[PDB]
Amino acid sequence: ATRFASVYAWNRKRISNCVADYSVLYNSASFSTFKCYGVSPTKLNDLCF
Amino acid sequence: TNVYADSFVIRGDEVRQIAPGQTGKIADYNYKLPDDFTGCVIAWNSNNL
């Protein structure tokens, strides 16, 4: 996105009825921090929500 | 009984990947430490060399 929301008014977008590919995100190497809680980053692509 | 010294250069942001059980471009595709690692990891900034 070009402009993000102010943290006091943080934006939320529902993701549903779609097929994901979390490997594209994790392997992007563009992120300084990538921390997952209760779910492993590598196994995340082998699961449904 | 024996000691093995491994040496390489990486980004400062990648030093955090040189630990047991880590993942990421370096830990996954360059240098992987075992889950039960028994050694020491030593690193320093080399921007002078």
Swiss-Prot record, chain B:
Result when mutating K25N: In strain: Beta/B.1.351, Omicron/BA.1, Omicron/BA.2, Omicron/BA.2.12.1, Omicron/BA.2.75, Omicron/BA.4, Omicron/BA.5, Omicron/BQ.1.1, Omicron/XBB.1.5, Omicron/EG.5.1; May enhance affinity to human ACE2 receptor
UniProt region (Integrin-binding motif), positions on chain: 11-13
Recorded consequence of changing D13N: In strain: Omicron/BA.2, Omicron/BA.2.12.1, Omicron/BA.2.75, Omicron/BA.4, Omicron/BA.5, Omicron/BQ.1.1, Omicron/XBB.1.5, Omicron/EG.5.1; complete loss of interaction with host integrins
Subunit structure: Binds to host ACE2. RBD also interacts with the N-linked glycan on 'Asn-90' of ACE2. Cleavage of S generates a polybasic C-terminal sequence on S1 that binds to host Neuropilin-1 (NRP1) and Neuropilin-2 (NRP2) receptors. Interacts with host integrin alpha-5/beta-1 (ITGA5:ITGB1) and with ACE2 in complex with integrin alpha-5/beta-1 (ITGA5:ITGB1). May interact via cytoplasmic c-terminus with M protein. May interact (via N-terminus) with host bilirubin and biliverdin, thereby preventing antibody binding to the SARS-CoV-2 spike NTD via an allosteric mechanism.
Protein function: Attaches the virion to the cell membrane by interacting with host receptor, initiating the infection. The major receptor is host ACE2. When S2/S2' has been cleaved, binding to the receptor triggers direct fusion at the cell membrane. When S2/S2' has not been cleaved, binding to the receptor results in internalization of the virus by endocytosis using host TFRC and GRM2 and leading to fusion of the virion membrane with the host endosomal membrane. Alternatively, may use NRP1/NRP2 and integrin as entry receptors.
Protein name: Spike protein S1
